Amino acid sequence: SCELPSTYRWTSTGALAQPRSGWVSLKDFTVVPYNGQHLVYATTHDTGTRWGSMNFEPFGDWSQMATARQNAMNSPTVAPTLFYFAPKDIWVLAYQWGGSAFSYRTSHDPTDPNGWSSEQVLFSGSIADSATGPIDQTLIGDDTHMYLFFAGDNGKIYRASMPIGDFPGSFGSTATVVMSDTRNNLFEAPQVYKLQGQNRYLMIVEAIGAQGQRYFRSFTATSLDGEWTPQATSESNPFAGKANSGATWTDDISHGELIRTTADQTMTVDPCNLQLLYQGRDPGSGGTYDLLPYRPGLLTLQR
Numbered sequence: 001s002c003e004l005p006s007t008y009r010w011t012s013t014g015a016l017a018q019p020r021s022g023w024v025s026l027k028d029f030t031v032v033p034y035n036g037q038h039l040v041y042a043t044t045h046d047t048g049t050r051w052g053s054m055n056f057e058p059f060g061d062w063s064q065m066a067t068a069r070q071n072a073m074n075s076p077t078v079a080p081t082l083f084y085f086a087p088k089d090i091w092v093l094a095y096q097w098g099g100s101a102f103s104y105r106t107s108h109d110p111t112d113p114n115g116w117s118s119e120q121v122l123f124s125g126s127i128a129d130s131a132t133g134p135i136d137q138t139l140i141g142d143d144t145h146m147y148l149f150f151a152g153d154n155g156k157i158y159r160a161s162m163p164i165g166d167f168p169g170s171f172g173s174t175a176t177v178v179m180s181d182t183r184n185n186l187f188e189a190p191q192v193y194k195l196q197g198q199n200r201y202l203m204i205v206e207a208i209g210a211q212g213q214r215y216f217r218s219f220t221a222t223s224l225d226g227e228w229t230p231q232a233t234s235e236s237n238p239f240a241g242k243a244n245s246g247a248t249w250t251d252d253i254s255h256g257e258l259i260r261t262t263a264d265q266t267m268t269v270d271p272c273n274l275q276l277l278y279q280g281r282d283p284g285s286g287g288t289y290d291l292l293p294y295r296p297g298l299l300t301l302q303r
């Protein structure tokens with residue numbers, strides 16, 4: 001195995017796909033391996049006010065993301081988390097802005113954008129001092145428990161848990177704060193992973209830098225119910241950001257996901273081959289947040 005570096009150095013692609021006509025952005029990627037291909041769901045925004053979601057047809061290599069058919073979902077699953085819940089042999093798509101704080105649906109065929117079950121409650125809690133409410137869930141399981149982590153655009157990261165045999169189901173209405181900082185330092189888009197070959201878990205969180213540029217900070221833990229330790233936690237020393245991305249097509253390195261070695265709920269990633277599918281936007285872009293022209297990019301860690 002390969003230890004996480006204390007200084008990350010990446011190289012980047014440019015934008016890997018453009019939104020199909022009618023959408024201004026592709027955002028908040030979730031991605032699994034599927035039958036030897038990449039299966040990606042994403043948030044969309046249209047040219048008016050509508051948040052939506054989509055998947056890409058499975059594609060074999062990252063050059064094929066640009067040509068993969070983009071399939072709209074009839075019922076949106078904004079800021080989605082996709083995984084295979086192996087203990088009950090069912091796929092799960094979790095998301096926000098349905099009927100409760102967080103929702104999920106299930107399927108046996110995650111390539112079908114419109115093949116998901118009816119909406120179920122994932123979380124029904126509220127949080128304090130948040131303009132948005134709970135946002136950007138991520139889920140991960142260990143041997144005995146499933147965990148829900150989320151943010152609130154408020155400087156806090158929250159955790160709920162349930163015995164793994166009780167999942168899929170609702171985590172209830174309460175959560176535990178596991179980290180807090182100034183609003184901009186722990187802002188949104190948390191993602192939690194288990195590192196292959198190591199007794200260690202990795203959390204990355206999106207932050208807002210001094211001039212508004214998005215970047216990620218990282219933290220580690222040795223158990224998912226334990227405490228989190230800063231691993232790379234500033235704009236000049238980030239997990240991934242303009243300081244170290246190798247990207248100039250974007251300054252932002254924002255809401256996305258690490259490439260995983262498995263689709264299942266363990267969220268396992270290979271520390272020897274870390275890659276981040278992120279959302280970025282042209283540095284000249286501006287105006288109202290919801291219309292910003294985000295697109296996917298991929299970072300590959302140098303070792």
Ligand SMILES: O[C@@H]1[C@@H](O)[C@H](O[C@@H]2CO[C@@H](O[C@@H]3CO[C@@H](O[C@@H]4CO[C@@H](O)[C@H](O)[C@H]4O)[C@H](O)[C@H]3O)[C@H](O)[C@H]2O)OC[C@H]1O
Binds near residue numbers: 051188289
């Ligand atoms: O009922 C649902 C609505 O609540 C939901 O509203 C969206 C809620 O999320 C909003 O996106 C948040 C908003 O702002 C971004 O952060 C700002 C970035 O610029 C900074 O200068 C500023 O300080 C920050 O606050 C944050 O990144 C983003 O996640 C979105 O604007 C609302 O449209 O819409 C769906 C309904 O079903």
Ligand SMILES: [Ca+2]
Binds near residue numbers: 079080136190256
């Ligand atoms: Ca996410």
Ligand SMILES: [K+]
């Ligand atoms: K967002």
